[PDB]
Amino acid sequence: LNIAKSETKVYTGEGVDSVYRVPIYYKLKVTNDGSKLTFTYTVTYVNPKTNDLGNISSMRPGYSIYNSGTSTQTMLTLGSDLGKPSGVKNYITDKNGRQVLSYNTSTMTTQGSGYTWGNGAQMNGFFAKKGYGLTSSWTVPITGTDTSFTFTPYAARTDRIGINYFNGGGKVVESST
Numbered sequence: 001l002n003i004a005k006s007e008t009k010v011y012t013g014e015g016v017d018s019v020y021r022v023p024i025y026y027k028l029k030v031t032n033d034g035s036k037l038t039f040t041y042t043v044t045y046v047n048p049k050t051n052d053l054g055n056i057s058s059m060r061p062g063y064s065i066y067n068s069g070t071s072t073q074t075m076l077t078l079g080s081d082l083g084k085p086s087g088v089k090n091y092i093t094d095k096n097g098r099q100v101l102s103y104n105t106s107t108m109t110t111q112g113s114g115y116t117w118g119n120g121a122q123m124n125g126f127f128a129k130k131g132y133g134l135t136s137s138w139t140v141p142i143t144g145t146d147t148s149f150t151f152t153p154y155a156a157r158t159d160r161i162g163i164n165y166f167n168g169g170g171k172v173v174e175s176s177t
Contacts, residue, residue, distance in 0.1 A: 006033040012048045013170025019063070019157060022054045023047065024165050026067075026153040027133075028172055037082065037140045037147065043067040043123070043155045044133030046095055053095075053131045063125035064158045065165075067134045068106075068117055072161055073168070076151050077114030079177075081144030084108075088138045090121035095131035108138070114150075122158055149174050 008031040017024045027048050029040040043065070046053045068075060076085070090103040106117040123134035140149075151172040155165040 011172045015166035040137045042133040042135040046131050059125040061126035064122045066120050068120040069154045074114040075116045079146040079148035081146040083141035086139045088117045088136050093133045093135045
């Protein structure tokens with residue numbers, strides 16, 4: 001009878017930055033308000049469990065990472081009753097998730113069985129070392145019952161896009177078929 005107006009899940013996972021041999025993390029927040037899903041995806045060196053930045057004091061200021069692959073990998077697959085994703089806003093967030101500055105909005109394209117985006121933003125080392133994250137957000141219309149999706153996190157240094165620091169592992173899978 002009294003159904004929730006919205007439901008939000010937060011997922012986190014972790015990989016390894018190959019260059020500095022430190023953990024790197026992601027957070028994916030997904031809110032369903034009945035009309036759309038809102039996705040907020042952050043890659044950061046701050047452990048979301050503790051809000052403590054790992055020791056990256058030796059990271060060079062001009063080192064830089066992407067949070068999205070090319071058609072190096074599908075990032076997002078969507079169930080049958082989800083529409084076309086919006087533009088993907090990109091921005092730097094501080095340790096508490098507050099926006100620091102905004103970058104170009106990316107456009108999602110297919111495929112293969114899903115979507116990726118281009119004009120992908122990046123985060124330089126001097127921001128990473130302040131505990132900042134590289135954050136992308138988008139919405140997806142809900143058109144029916146099958147609101148399943150899978151999301152595959154990605155992070156790579158900008159001169160080696162073929163090496164995903166999350167190594168295809170911590171995939172987010174939401175049912176139901």
